[PDB]
Design an enzyme around this catalytic site. Sequence first.
Site, PDB file in Angstrom:
ATOM      1  CG  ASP A 117      -6.137  -9.574   0.179  1.00  0.00           C
ATOM      2  OD1 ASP A 117      -5.696  -8.728   0.968  1.00  0.00           O
ATOM      3  OD2 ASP A 117      -6.551  -9.253  -0.955  1.00  0.00           O
ATOM      4  CB  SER A 177      -8.615  -1.645  -1.830  1.00  0.00           C
ATOM      5  OG  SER A 177      -7.411  -1.686  -1.077  1.00  0.00           O
ATOM      6  CG  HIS A 222      -7.703  -5.532   1.180  1.00  0.00           C
ATOM      7  ND1 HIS A 222      -6.750  -6.122   0.376  1.00  0.00           N
ATOM      8  CD2 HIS A 222      -7.999  -4.344   0.606  1.00  0.00           C
ATOM      9  CE1 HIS A 222      -6.477  -5.318  -0.639  1.00  0.00           C
ATOM     10  NE2 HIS A 222      -7.218  -4.227  -0.523  1.00  0.00           N
TER      11      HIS A 222
END
Lengths: 364, 365
Positions: free
Chosen positions: A310, A22, A313
Amino acid sequence: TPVTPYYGPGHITFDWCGFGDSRSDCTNPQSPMSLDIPQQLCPKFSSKSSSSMFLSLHWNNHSSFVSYDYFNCGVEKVFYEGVNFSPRKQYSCWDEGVDGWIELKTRFYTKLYQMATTSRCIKLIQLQAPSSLPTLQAGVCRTNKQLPDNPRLALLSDTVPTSVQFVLPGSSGTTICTKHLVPFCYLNHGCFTTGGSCLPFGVSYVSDSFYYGYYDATPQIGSTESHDYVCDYLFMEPGTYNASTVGKFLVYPTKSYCMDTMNITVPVQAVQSIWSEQYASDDAIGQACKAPYCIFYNKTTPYTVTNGSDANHGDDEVRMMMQGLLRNSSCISPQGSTPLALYSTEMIYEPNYGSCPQFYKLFD
Amino acid sequence: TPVTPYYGPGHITFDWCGFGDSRSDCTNPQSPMSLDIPQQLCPKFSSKSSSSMFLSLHWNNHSSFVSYDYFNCGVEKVFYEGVNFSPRKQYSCWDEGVDGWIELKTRFYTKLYQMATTSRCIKLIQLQAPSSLPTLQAGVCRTNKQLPDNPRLALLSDTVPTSVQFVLPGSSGTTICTKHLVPFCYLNHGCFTTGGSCLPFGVSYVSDSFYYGYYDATPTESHDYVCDYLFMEPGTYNASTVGKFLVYPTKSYCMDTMNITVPVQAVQSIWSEQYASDDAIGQACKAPYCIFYNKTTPYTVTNGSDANHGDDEVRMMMQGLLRNSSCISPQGSTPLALYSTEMIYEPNYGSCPQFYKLFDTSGNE
Ligand SMILES: *[C@@H]1O[C@H](CO)[C@@H](O[C@@H]2O[C@H](CO)[C@@H](O[C@@H]3O[C@H](CO[C@H]4O[C@H](CO)[C@@H](O)[C@H](O)[C@@H]4O)[C@@H](O)[C@H](O[C@H]4O[C@H](CO)[C@@H](O)[C@H](O)[C@@H]4O)[C@@H]3O)[C@H](O)[C@H]2NC(C)=O)[C@H](O)[C@H]1NC(C)=O
Ligand SMILES: *[C@@H]1O[C@H](CO)[C@@H](O[C@@H]2O[C@H](CO)[C@@H](O[C@@H]3O[C@H](CO)[C@@H](O)[C@H](O[C@H]4O[C@H](CO)[C@@H](O)[C@H](O)[C@@H]4O)[C@@H]3O)[C@H](O)[C@H]2NC(C)=O)[C@H](O)[C@H]1NC(C)=O
Ligand SMILES: *[C@@H]1O[C@H](CO)[C@@H](O[C@@H]2O[C@H](CO)[C@@H](O[C@@H]3O[C@H](CO[C@H]4O[C@H](CO)[C@@H](O)[C@H](O)[C@@H]4O)[C@@H](O)[C@H](O)[C@@H]3O)[C@H](O)[C@H]2NC(C)=O)[C@H](O)[C@H]1NC(C)=O
Ligand SMILES: *[C@@H]1O[C@H](CO)[C@@H](O[C@@H]2O[C@H](CO)[C@@H](O[C@@H]3O[C@H](CO)[C@@H](O)[C@H](O)[C@@H]3O)[C@H](O)[C@H]2NC(C)=O)[C@H](O)[C@H]1NC(C)=O
Ligand SMILES: *[C@@H]1O[C@H](CO)[C@@H](O[C@@H]2O[C@H](CO)[C@@H](O)[C@H](O)[C@H]2NC(C)=O)[C@H](O)[C@H]1NC(C)=O
Ligand SMILES: *[C@@H]1O[C@H](CO)[C@@H](O[C@@H]2O[C@H](CO)[C@@H](O)[C@H](O)[C@H]2NC(C)=O)[C@H](O)[C@H]1NC(C)=O
Ligand SMILES: *[C@@H]1O[C@H](CO)[C@@H](O[C@@H]2O[C@H](CO)[C@@H](O)[C@H](O)[C@H]2NC(C)=O)[C@H](O)[C@H]1NC(C)=O
Ligand SMILES: *[C@@H]1O[C@H](CO)[C@@H](O)[C@H](O)[C@H]1NC(C)=O
Ligand SMILES: *[C@@H]1O[C@H](CO)[C@@H](O)[C@H](O)[C@H]1NC(C)=O
Ligand SMILES: *[C@@H]1O[C@H](CO)[C@@H](O)[C@H](O)[C@H]1NC(C)=O
């Protein structure tokens, strides 16, 4: 005037690539807030939110498994994934425990990094189903968590020796496969009770010029029968092989990492891939990324987000490290990157490559 | 001031050692005419005439086998042996042929060099026999040449699945063994007919944290003697069998750990042109773990004890070990400098000069 290595990964020519999750996936709905790399470097990465290269070897898509067809080519290689298979996931299959899979994770990355240093391209491929498959009952995990899709573990209707043929191709699209990283797995700790008796567990991959196997028919004591799901990650040349069995249990691979060959060895680069301290992480990447085949860029701080999507990340440390990939460097080392220079402000350690400055104090 | 790599091995610090054979053995009756190294470097070498590290792992002493207790310690390491197990010897045991044994030689040296790069000491040790051993009949070679003494291959008096325990020790004398290079061998290609049936050949080395095994029950009956060379931690292990055939190690290379990874150096070890050599050392000694110094000429002696002792090329190469060096590479050694007159490739270590042309300001480049 001595130069200071910039701490983080880097590259010396255009021919570099990245593998990620991600944190380097610009298709993420929260990008660029969810990135740890500079947005403009997304095209250099083969990355998918919630995936890892280990998870994707063993599984296709399931409810908590996001599988990605990792694919990239580069003389130099930067890895920043791994976290999506960590102790937070709480995964095990047989009696090996969560720690068992952290050992398998470690084995896999160790082999991947080693094999990567003599390849340019790395491509996760689906293998063809063997021809003329006999009747098979799907294997299960004792934990009832998702059984790996690769290698396949299944049960034959009988208990006699048998063999099926699998093909590791010599190419996949325009990628040449001069070798394959292939998992070989088994249920260890003696005979396995099924069909009403305790049967030998004996499986192997064989050809005229290859052998790797496991065999155990050791009887069980009392009611203590226990087995662990164990894997070895093998280097296999392209060609046709047999997945053999002494009976009942059949194991054959359904996916591999196809790699080509480059004629110079170049260490890969791996960046520590962990969760925030709300969650349980492991050190499989750091234990796998070792001299002489891998340059490990560890984090000295926790995963620490001040302006991300968040808590997991947008780490400030890794963000700073990854700025190193924007520069055209001459020297790559565990201390980081430098341009072309006579002297360094600190000792440059191994592994390193390119043309590296020398510690200034050596020349007084 | 600019430097040029000196072709041959070298050392940067006091903490180096060598492993060798007749060509670095000062005890040889013909020394120093029989040497390829400077005579004054003999004490830096663990060497015995007629031996090699490969031969000594698999065999103890016999009429055709000179086994040596190789032992030395050094951060930096120079290997110059191998020739005393080459195709000249025409050794084979089962159906694998001499090429089979050149492949095993290559496997062994590959593993040796790899493991050496994170060790300081390397010591060939005689393991103790398993404390409990049933009646055993020694194996043999189809060719009637000498069966390897390590690992032991022997035959139990029934077909009952059996385990014996072997100990890979945590130390030997003053040497700490943090790991062991241990051979695992077997006869491949199907079941093996003996004691009235074609029996499965299944053997393994097993502990709670370790498994390596081979099994085959499948149906001229031909077999090859095959070995793999395994990294094993000190501890007690089962040598297990599914029945009849028993394989357990009797010798290992005990190695300690150092907290740096330093490539080893290997010099090509061959016979004169009238005899059969191999390139196992060149095939084993690869980046990133080993710096190979090949010969560019045949084994050529103009002032030595015989046609196979006193090579002019290697003698010149070994002069490198007397030099002031800060950089060790496949091109050879240099002292500490800014610029090299030629490109320096990998593996290399130390503080190495950069290729002069990279800094040219002419620019005719
Ligand atoms: C292994 O090999 C290395 C590399 O060759 C050797 O290291 C070199 O050793 C030499 C000799 O000691 C060093 O050169 C000497 O440096 C001295 C100090 O110079 C510094 O300071 C002056 C200003 O005072 C500056 O101009 C200069 O640039 C330096 O910053 C000098 O005193 C020496 O001068 C000598 O030669 C000149 C010739 O004209 C005369 O004045 C005198 O004869 C005088 O003695 C000389 O320049 C050199 O710096 C080292 N090189 C490196 C790269 O480190 C190791 O010594 C060698 N080791 C062994 C054991 O053999
Ligand atoms: C294979 O067989 C050969 C013999 O054919 C064998 O080689 C011999 O090994 C021994 C011991 O390593 C050597 O004996 C030593 O020789 C030196 C001279 O260089 C002496 O200084 C030694 O004396 C000291 O140590 C002795 C204890 O070993 C003490 O008794 C004494 O007080 C001294 O302190 C000692 O005599 C011998 O020279 C070689 N011989 C040959 C021909 O190489 C080899 O070890 C065998 N291989 C295996 C694996 O067993
Ligand atoms: C260390 O140095 C050795 C001596 O130079 C190297 O020996 C060479 O080994 C390679 C294989 O690794 C051989 O290559 C083969 O060549 C033949 C053709 O043979 C004929 O032509 C060549 C070249 O003109 C000539 O050298 C031969 O003598 C023959 O006349 C091909 O058919 C094969 O496919 C294969 O490519 C070399 O022949 C061989 N040379 C010599 C002189 O022995 C050795 O490779 C070096 N090791 C390392 C690790 O670098
Ligand atoms: C598992 O499930 C997911 C969907 O939930 C599959 O993801 C999809 O994968 C395809 C192929 O990679 C993606 O298409 C690609 O889009 C990019 C960027 O726009 C483009 O450059 C590529 O060439 C390709 O077209 C698709 O976007 C993606 N969908 C989502 C929602 O992420 C995944 O392939 C499945 N995994 C396996 C192993 O089957
Ligand atoms: C990478 O850095 C981390 C953080 O320092 C290391 O993890 C620590 O390991 C030490 C020694 O085992 C433990 O005392 C700490 O509690 C660990 N801290 C954290 C946050 O996990 C880790 O070992 C390093 N990895 C490598 C390969 O060096
Ligand atoms: C937090 O991150 C956001 C998202 O990347 C940053 O917003 C960008 O800021 C630059 C100017 O600094 C703008 O040109 C971009 O258009 C912004 N992008 C987006 C997607 O909003 C922001 O600068 C960061 N905030 C802090 C305090 O560092
Ligand atoms: C060698 O194998 C034997 C027999 O299969 C193992 O013996 C078992 O070990 C545990 C002790 O930890 C006992 O609780 C079991 O009852 C033992 N079984 C039998 C039949 O004795 C032994 O652990 C193995 N040894 C090694 C070093 O791995
Ligand atoms: C491998 O499997 C095939 C079935 O596709 C079989 O015909 C062949 O005999 C097998 N080979 C061995 C050595 O088991
Ligand atoms: C190597 O490091 C370990 C800890 O990682 C330490 O216990 C030991 O002192 C070091 N050993 C040597 C030989 O330097
Ligand atoms: C030949 O070898 C001898 C014995 O070591 C040596 O003393 C002599 O210098 C050598 N002769 C020549 C011409 O190099």
